[PDB]
PDB file of C-alpha atoms in Angstrom:
ATOM      1  CA  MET A   1      28.206  11.258 -22.004  1.00  0.00           C
ATOM      2  CA  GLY A   2      28.366  11.640 -18.139  1.00  0.00           C
ATOM      3  CA  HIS A   3      24.775  10.335 -17.561  1.00  0.00           C
ATOM      4  CA  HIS A   4      24.745  12.109 -13.943  1.00  0.00           C
ATOM      5  CA  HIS A   5      21.741  11.305 -11.604  1.00  0.00           C
ATOM      6  CA  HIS A   6      20.898  12.679  -7.880  1.00  0.00           C
ATOM      7  CA  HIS A   7      17.963  11.488  -5.663  1.00  0.00           C
ATOM      8  CA  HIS A   8      16.926  12.182  -2.021  1.00  0.00           C
ATOM      9  CA  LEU A   9      18.216  10.160   0.849  1.00  0.00           C
ATOM     10  CA  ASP A  10      17.409   6.684  -0.316  1.00  0.00           C
ATOM     11  CA  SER A  11      15.316   5.687   3.265  1.00  0.00           C
ATOM     12  CA  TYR A  12      12.947   8.462   2.280  1.00  0.00           C
ATOM     13  CA  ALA A  13       9.648   8.461   0.771  1.00  0.00           C
ATOM     14  CA  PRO A  14       6.994  11.292   0.375  1.00  0.00           C
ATOM     15  CA  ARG A  15       4.133  11.071   3.583  1.00  0.00           C
ATOM     16  CA  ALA A  16       1.317   8.567   3.868  1.00  0.00           C
ATOM     17  CA  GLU A  17      -2.109   9.628   2.910  1.00  0.00           C
ATOM     18  CA  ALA A  18      -4.916   9.839   5.140  1.00  0.00           C
ATOM     19  CA  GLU A  19      -7.416   6.792   6.451  1.00  0.00           C
ATOM     20  CA  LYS A  20      -9.904   5.922   3.701  1.00  0.00           C
ATOM     21  CA  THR A  21     -12.951   3.560   3.880  1.00  0.00           C
ATOM     22  CA  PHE A  22     -13.345   0.387   1.632  1.00  0.00           C
ATOM     23  CA  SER A  23     -15.481  -2.466   0.817  1.00  0.00           C
ATOM     24  CA  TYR A  24     -16.277  -4.836  -2.001  1.00  0.00           C
ATOM     25  CA  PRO A  25     -16.922  -5.564  -4.959  1.00  0.00           C
ATOM     26  CA  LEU A  26     -15.235  -2.387  -5.976  1.00  0.00           C
ATOM     27  CA  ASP A  27     -13.043  -0.809  -9.198  1.00  0.00           C
ATOM     28  CA  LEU A  28      -9.893  -1.435  -6.913  1.00  0.00           C
ATOM     29  CA  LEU A  29      -7.555  -4.605  -6.641  1.00  0.00           C
ATOM     30  CA  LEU A  30      -4.260  -5.135  -4.850  1.00  0.00           C
ATOM     31  CA  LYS A  31      -1.423  -7.545  -5.535  1.00  0.00           C
ATOM     32  CA  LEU A  32       1.896  -8.901  -3.703  1.00  0.00           C
ATOM     33  CA  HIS A  33       5.074  -7.143  -4.605  1.00  0.00           C
ATOM     34  CA  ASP A  34       8.469  -7.153  -2.774  1.00  0.00           C
ATOM     35  CA  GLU A  35       7.029  -8.018   0.915  1.00  0.00           C
ATOM     36  CA  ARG A  36       4.252  -5.498   0.398  1.00  0.00           C
ATOM     37  CA  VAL A  37       0.504  -5.003  -1.121  1.00  0.00           C
ATOM     38  CA  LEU A  38       0.584  -2.482  -3.582  1.00  0.00           C
ATOM     39  CA  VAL A  39      -2.494  -1.392  -6.091  1.00  0.00           C
ATOM     40  CA  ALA A  40      -2.591  -3.447  -8.505  1.00  0.00           C
ATOM     41  CA  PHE A  41      -5.582  -1.308 -10.315  1.00  0.00           C
ATOM     42  CA  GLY A  42      -8.343   1.238  -9.522  1.00  0.00           C
ATOM     43  CA  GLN A  43      -6.428   4.588 -10.851  1.00  0.00           C
ATOM     44  CA  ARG A  44      -8.441   7.502 -12.132  1.00  0.00           C
ATOM     45  CA  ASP A  45      -5.261   7.940 -14.730  1.00  0.00           C
ATOM     46  CA  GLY A  46      -2.454   6.800 -13.161  1.00  0.00           C
ATOM     47  CA  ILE A  47      -1.774   8.602  -9.565  1.00  0.00           C
ATOM     48  CA  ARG A  48      -3.008   5.080  -8.001  1.00  0.00           C
ATOM     49  CA  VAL A  49      -1.040   1.969  -9.290  1.00  0.00           C
ATOM     50  CA  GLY A  50       2.165   1.282  -7.602  1.00  0.00           C
ATOM     51  CA  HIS A  51       1.280   2.932  -4.049  1.00  0.00           C
ATOM     52  CA  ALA A  52       1.465   0.524  -0.925  1.00  0.00           C
ATOM     53  CA  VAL A  53      -1.049  -0.326   2.251  1.00  0.00           C
ATOM     54  CA  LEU A  54       0.525   0.949   5.576  1.00  0.00           C
ATOM     55  CA  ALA A  55      -2.219  -0.224   8.126  1.00  0.00           C
ATOM     56  CA  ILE A  56      -5.619  -1.592   7.682  1.00  0.00           C
ATOM     57  CA  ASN A  57      -7.952  -0.962  10.804  1.00  0.00           C
ATOM     58  CA  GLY A  58      -5.225   0.510  12.886  1.00  0.00           C
ATOM     59  CA  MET A  59      -3.046  -2.319  12.530  1.00  0.00           C
ATOM     60  CA  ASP A  60       0.056  -1.073  11.047  1.00  0.00           C
ATOM     61  CA  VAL A  61       1.064  -4.348   8.437  1.00  0.00           C
ATOM     62  CA  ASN A  62       3.943  -6.439   8.810  1.00  0.00           C
ATOM     63  CA  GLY A  63       4.417  -5.468   5.076  1.00  0.00           C
ATOM     64  CA  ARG A  64       1.984  -7.927   3.619  1.00  0.00           C
ATOM     65  CA  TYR A  65       0.350  -9.276   6.956  1.00  0.00           C
ATOM     66  CA  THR A  66      -1.443  -7.661   9.665  1.00  0.00           C
ATOM     67  CA  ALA A  67      -0.220  -6.601  13.325  1.00  0.00           C
ATOM     68  CA  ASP A  68      -2.017 -10.314  14.221  1.00  0.00           C
ATOM     69  CA  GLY A  69      -0.311 -11.953  11.242  1.00  0.00           C
ATOM     70  CA  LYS A  70      -3.551 -12.477   8.983  1.00  0.00           C
ATOM     71  CA  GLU A  71      -1.767 -11.775   5.200  1.00  0.00           C
ATOM     72  CA  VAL A  72      -3.686  -9.051   3.920  1.00  0.00           C
ATOM     73  CA  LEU A  73      -4.445 -10.351   0.727  1.00  0.00           C
ATOM     74  CA  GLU A  74      -7.080 -13.057   2.807  1.00  0.00           C
ATOM     75  CA  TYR A  75      -7.925 -10.689   5.130  1.00  0.00           C
ATOM     76  CA  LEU A  76      -9.417  -7.820   2.755  1.00  0.00           C
ATOM     77  CA  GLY A  77     -10.491 -10.753   0.634  1.00  0.00           C
ATOM     78  CA  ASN A  78     -12.505 -12.399   3.499  1.00  0.00           C
ATOM     79  CA  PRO A  79     -16.277 -10.801   2.699  1.00  0.00           C
ATOM     80  CA  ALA A  80     -16.633 -11.431   6.763  1.00  0.00           C
ATOM     81  CA  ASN A  81     -14.307  -8.170   6.703  1.00  0.00           C
ATOM     82  CA  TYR A  82     -15.188  -6.583   3.497  1.00  0.00           C
ATOM     83  CA  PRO A  83     -15.705  -3.343   5.165  1.00  0.00           C
ATOM     84  CA  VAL A  84     -12.912  -1.774   6.379  1.00  0.00           C
ATOM     85  CA  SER A  85     -10.548   1.696   6.935  1.00  0.00           C
ATOM     86  CA  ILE A  86      -6.923   1.300   5.404  1.00  0.00           C
ATOM     87  CA  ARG A  87      -4.044   3.779   5.595  1.00  0.00           C
ATOM     88  CA  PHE A  88      -1.675   3.461   2.410  1.00  0.00           C
ATOM     89  CA  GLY A  89       0.332   5.728   0.653  1.00  0.00           C
ATOM     90  CA  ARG A  90       4.052   5.737  -1.214  1.00  0.00           C
ATOM     91  CA  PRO A  91       6.172   2.533  -0.980  1.00  0.00           C
ATOM     92  CA  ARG A  92       9.512   3.198   1.373  1.00  0.00           C
ATOM     93  CA  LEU A  93       8.067   5.540   3.552  1.00  0.00           C
ATOM     94  CA  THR A  94      10.957   4.248   5.854  1.00  0.00           C
ATOM     95  CA  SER A  95      13.376   1.534   5.642  1.00  0.00           C
ATOM     96  CA  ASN A  96      11.502  -0.304   8.821  1.00  0.00           C
TER      97      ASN A  96
END
């Protein structure tokens, strides 16, 4: 009965994490979902899958493209650009 629910402001989510270096091959994999690049695998236990990319080398990502317009999966997949720094966090940090 009732099955009531409540949540914080829909526009919001917890803050982004700090910038971190990445390179490949690595025990980390990313995928495209809902016009965002998300962690597919690489969790120590669970607290990593479903996190979303927010910038790469300071280019705030246009969902799944760089600021320049490279698709993030191809951009990171290119081994000429394997060594990178990434900013990532909870999805829906803001609606835009």
